[PDB]
């Protein structure tokens, strides 16, 4: 829990003395609509009070809640207050200019051209920038050298470190599209990786993957899935990859929650065999909060919970996919914490899984993954990465982890 703080100010002749960014339709951080303090005006009320800081998140001012408001709504609320201003703020636990992007591109070029390659500098920069900032770096690099940064780094780097850095240079949709393409390489597929991506990505993420996949490979993702999978496993993967799950409605449909729970029990544990199309329809079409409540209501009817019912009712790839999907519905950060543990726990390392999760979740929910990991396994994700990887490859992964717990 981030620290929530109360700050009271007197509105001065020149206002409150700070600047805000963020808001619905004006995100200061990708995927985050919150209002953020971005400047403290010297001599103003905020500065003389001393508590408010850059990076603080505004939760409310007087009678106005500032969560999920547009930028203009926040401005109007903050400019039309009483003289007595009571701010509710949340403390954290970037001001990235073109100068920063150009300097990064220039320093990366120097690191590439250095004899023996200065991998340390390359890692220090790229693993400590957001995906959008890396995109800015890649465009600045191309403008300066007339060469693609990814191609230059492919030649300068090797091993698992090259895999990390080149994956970070792709947009989220490009990275997932190329990982899905790689998973379907050859007869059939790496079902584990296909399952991991298709079961964990949201509607919005899948919609962008579907578009970028077609642009990169000149074929639909759905057609490639169909060509390399079969049976009920194919049906489940195809249904999920469409990214047409019901969106989180504000109204909870309790009658449907009960009927879905009965239908899941009637389709499996209650009867000989399993009505797999019924399971597919319910678990791919209902919203995630709805299904969380369905899986709890299911326990009212069934002698086993949903995960145990899946193990007893189906087998093979279909069982694996359903088990991964239900974990993603119930607790996705815990799901990735478990896959990370499994990638490192035994002899060697499943670097393909370790790299993909660290690259793809570093900007999504890495803090929640780290929290679930430490709570379950007693040691930090940082520690397990330290014990299973070495050198600059380790340093890159540790930066994507973001810290020790």
């Amino acid at each position: 829990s981030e620290k929530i703080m109360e700050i009271k100010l007197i509105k001065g002749p020149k206002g409150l003395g700070f600047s805000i960014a963020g808001g619905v339709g004006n995100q200061h951080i990708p995927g985050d609509n919150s209002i953020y303090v971005t400047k403290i005006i010297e001599g103003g009320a905020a500065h003389k009070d001393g508590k408010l800081q850059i990076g603080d998140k505004l939760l409310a001012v007087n009678n106005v809640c500032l969560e999920e408001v547009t930028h203009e709504e926040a401005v109007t609320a903050l400019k039309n207050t009483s003289d007595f201003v009571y701010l509710k703020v949340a403390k954290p636990t970037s001001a990235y200019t073109n100068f920063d992007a150009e300097r990064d591109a220039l320093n990366i070029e120097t690191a590439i051209k250095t004899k023996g390659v200065d991998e340390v500098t390359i890692v220090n920069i790229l693993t400590n920038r957001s995906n959008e900032q890396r995109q800015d770096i890649a465009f600045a690099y191309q403008r300066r050298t007339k060469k693609e940064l990814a191609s230059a780094l492919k030649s300068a780097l090797s091993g698992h470190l090259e895999t990390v850095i080149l994956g970070l240079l792709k947009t989220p949709a490009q990275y997932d599209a190329s990982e899905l393409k790689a998973s379907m390489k050859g007869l059939g597929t790496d079902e584990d990786s296909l399952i991991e991506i298709i079961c964990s990505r949201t509607n919005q993420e899948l919609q962008e993957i579907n578009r970028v996949y077609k642009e990169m490979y000149k074929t639909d993702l759905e057609k490639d899935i169909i060509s390399d999978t079969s049976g009920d496993f194919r049906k489940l993967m195809v249904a999920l990859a469409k990214g047409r799950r019901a969106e989180d409605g504000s109204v909870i449909d309790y009658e449907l929650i009960d009927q879905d729970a009965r239908d899941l029990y009637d389709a499996g544990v209650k009867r000989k065999g399993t009505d797999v199309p019924k399971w597919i329809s319910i678990m791919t079409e209902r919203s995630v909060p709805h299904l969380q409540k369905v899986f709890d209501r299911y326990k009212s009817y069934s002698p086993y919970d949903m995960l145990e019912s899946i193990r007893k009712e189906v087998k093979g790839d279909l069982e694996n996919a359903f088990l991964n999907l239900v974990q993603c519905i119930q607790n996705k950060p815990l799901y990735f914490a478990d896959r990370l543990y499994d990638s490192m726990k035994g002899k060697g390392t499943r670097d393909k899984v370790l790299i993909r999760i660290m690259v793809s979740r570093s900007e999504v929910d890495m803090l929640k993954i780290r929290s679930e990991f430490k709570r379950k396994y007693g040691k930090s994700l940082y520690y397990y990465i330290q014990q299973d990887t070495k050198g600059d490859y380790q340093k890159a992964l540790l930066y994507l982890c973001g810290g020790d717990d």
Binding site: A21, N26, H28, T38, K39
Partner: peptide, 7 residues
């Protein structure tokens, strides 16, 4: 372009 506003 993103908006930043002084208050």
């Amino acid at each position: 372009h993103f908006r930043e506003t002084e208050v």
